């Protein structure tokens, strides 16, 4: 459920993780790792 009202159906790791807001900085680091993997090669986002 997008904060602006949108709906996202996906099983992509980066697509799911980019929509989660977290407070623990370790979770922020993990999300940044997911985004790095998605931008660098575009695949293997859940695997990393």
């Amino acid at each position: 459920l997008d904060p602006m009202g949108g709906i996202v159906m996906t099983n992509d790791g980066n697509a799911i993780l980019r929509e989660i807001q977290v407070q623990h900085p370790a979770a922020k680091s993990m999300i940044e790792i997911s985004r790095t993997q998605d931008e660098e090669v575009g695949d293997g986002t859940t695997s990393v």
């Binding site: 940044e32 790792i33 790095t36």
Partner: protein, 532 residues
């Protein structure tokens, strides 16, 4: 009676409060000292995260209230600015000096005597360091630089990869080397453009043999690769000409309006034609470029980059031999662009780095420069790599400028403590206690290293002190001055043989700054805090 609108603290209370604040600052960063130290994660109540090990960065990000603590924070900042290394050791030493001085004061020793003793002890420590413990790097070679960089890069995110990172650091520093008047080789760090980009492993970090720009070509029409680049650096924008504030256009005959409007862009057209007629291939400007000028560059098969940073443009011009032209005005009142104002480079390529593009200028002529592209796992890792890399570059610059280094691992400070506790008996009657307390406070760093390593700090420091005492007493054991700490095995080790070095300037400046800060805080015996 006083009727002062504020709170007043006098006597032992204010001194204890000041020492409490200094100890709090020291304990904030005490856990990030030495190779067995660990980083810290800082959150700024908005979401931004800063994973760091540098003491100066940690103390700068924190918001501090007590003035005595702010003194230590600015002390760390000054140590970073003037040296670049040891920003944690200086804070720890200053806090320990303050604590021991407060203990002496509580023992009814007048603070003036303590301050005099501290000054004498600092002077003698500097003299002993410069006389005995220094090692001349002339007989060592490039291995000394490699070892110094590796030592500086320990306790950092790039500590394990030092075998390659130190080589990169030394190569960059040697590349940016220049000489000045009086024949003094000066190494201008901060001329190494550090670029960060997440992606591949740290082993894929690139040392560019040239310069790296964080900019792309202005339009997709222009080629992204020029072989024999003729760089033209400009300090002025290339836009449609707009007349100054003091000039206005008033039309009484309509027939001149079209001519005026046409010349309004023909001026920039002529300037671009003058620039391109000399064979320039790459054009870098600090100002902006609009669509028509971009098209002009496209049709000529050139390469135009807009909004180039002034410092980057200056570095590129210096490296390539180009001269930055603020305007196309010569001494004859005309508009000319000579070919002598063109830099030369072996290649200019717009490479792709993790779904983003940056411009690489390779193998500049008439001068060799360097740039480092750091590849990490995310933004925080890249930032920490950049900080550690800057520390290593500063350390290598210090080693190359001043050709003396001292053994690391606490050997220098153990030797200093032994020598100072021996020398205290020969100076004064009450300042000797201050000298002895200075010597004892100097042992806080090896103690902190041993504690961080989870080793027996008391026994290890006792063994180190015994080794250094035997070295200073026995005239035939001058080779034992290098015995320091091996944090991995938790045993004393000859660090000069092991290759644990650091610049003498680091210890000298840290000692002087810590002594001055402790003396400054020690003078305060009354605090008046006016209400806002």
């Amino acid at each position: 009676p006083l009727s002062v609108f504020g709170d007043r603290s006098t006597g032992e209370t204010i001194r204890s409060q000041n020492v409490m604040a200094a100890a709090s600052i020291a304990n904030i960063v005490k856990s990030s000292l030495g190779p067995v130290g660990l980083d810290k994660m800082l959150v700024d109540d908005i979401g931004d995260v800063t994973i760091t090990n540098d003491g100066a960065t940690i103390l700068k990000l924190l918001e501090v209230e007590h003035p005595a603590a702010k003194v230590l924070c600015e002390l760390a900042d000054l140590q970073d600015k003037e040296v670049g290394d040891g920003t944690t050791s200086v804070v720890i030493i200053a806090a320990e000096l303050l604590k021991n001085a407060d203990e002496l004061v509580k023992q009814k020793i007048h603070p003036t005597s303590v301050i005099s003793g501290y000054r004498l002890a600092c002077k003698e420590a500097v003299r002993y360091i410069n006389e005995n413990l220094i090692v001349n790097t002339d007989e060592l070679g490039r291995d000394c630089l490699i070892n110094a960089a590796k030592t500086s890069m320990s306790s950092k995110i790039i500590g394990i990869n030092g075998d390659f990172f130190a080589n990169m650091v030394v190569d960059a520093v040697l590349a940016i080397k220049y000489t000045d008047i009086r024949g003094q080789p000066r190494y201008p760090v901060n001329s190494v453009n550090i670029l960060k980009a997440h992606g591949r492993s740290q082993m894929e970090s690139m040392l560019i043999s040239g310069y790296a720009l964080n900019c792309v070509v202005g339009s997709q029409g222009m080629p992204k690769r020029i072989v024999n680049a003729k760089i033209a650096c400009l300090d002025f924008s290339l836009q449609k000409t707009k007349m100054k504030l003091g000039v206005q256009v008033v039309i009484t005959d309509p027939e001149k309006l079209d001519q005026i409007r046409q010349r309004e862009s023909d001026i920039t057209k002529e300037r671009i034609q003058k620039i391109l007629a000399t064979g320039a291939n790459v054009i870098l400007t600090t100002g902006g470029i609009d669509d028509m000028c971009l098209k002009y560059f496209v049709e000529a098969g050139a390469m135009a980059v807009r909004r180039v940073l002034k410092r980057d443009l200056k570095r590129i011009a210096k490296a390539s031999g180009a001269t930055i032209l603020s305007t196309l005005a010569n001494l004859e009142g005309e508009e000319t662009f000579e070919a002598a104002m063109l830099g030369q480079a072996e290649e200019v390529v717009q490479e792709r780095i993790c779904d983003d593009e940056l411009i690489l200028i390779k193998n500049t002529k008439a001068r060799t420069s360097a740039s480092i592209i750091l590849r990490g796992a995310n933004d925080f890792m890249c930032d920490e790599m950049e900080r550690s890399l800057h520390d290593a570059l500063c350390v290598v610059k210090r080693v190359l400028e001043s050709k003396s280094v001292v053994p690391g691992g606490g050997a220098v400070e153990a030797a200093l403590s032994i020598y100072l506790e021996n020398y205290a008996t020969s100076m004064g009657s009450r300042e000797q206690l201050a000298i002895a307390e200075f010597a004892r406070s100097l042992l806080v760093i090896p103690n902190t290293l041993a504690v961080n390593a989870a080793q027996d700090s008391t026994d290890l420091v006792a063994k180190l002190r015994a080794f250094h005492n035997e070295a200073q007493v026995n005239p035939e054991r001058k080779n034992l001055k290098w015995i320091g700490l091996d944090l991995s095995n938790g045993k004393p080790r000859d660090n000069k043989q092991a290759g644990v070095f650091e610049p003498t300037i680091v210890k000298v400046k840290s000692l002087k700054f810590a002594t001055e800060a402790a003396i400054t805080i020690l003078r305060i015996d009354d605090l008046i805090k006016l209400h806002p």
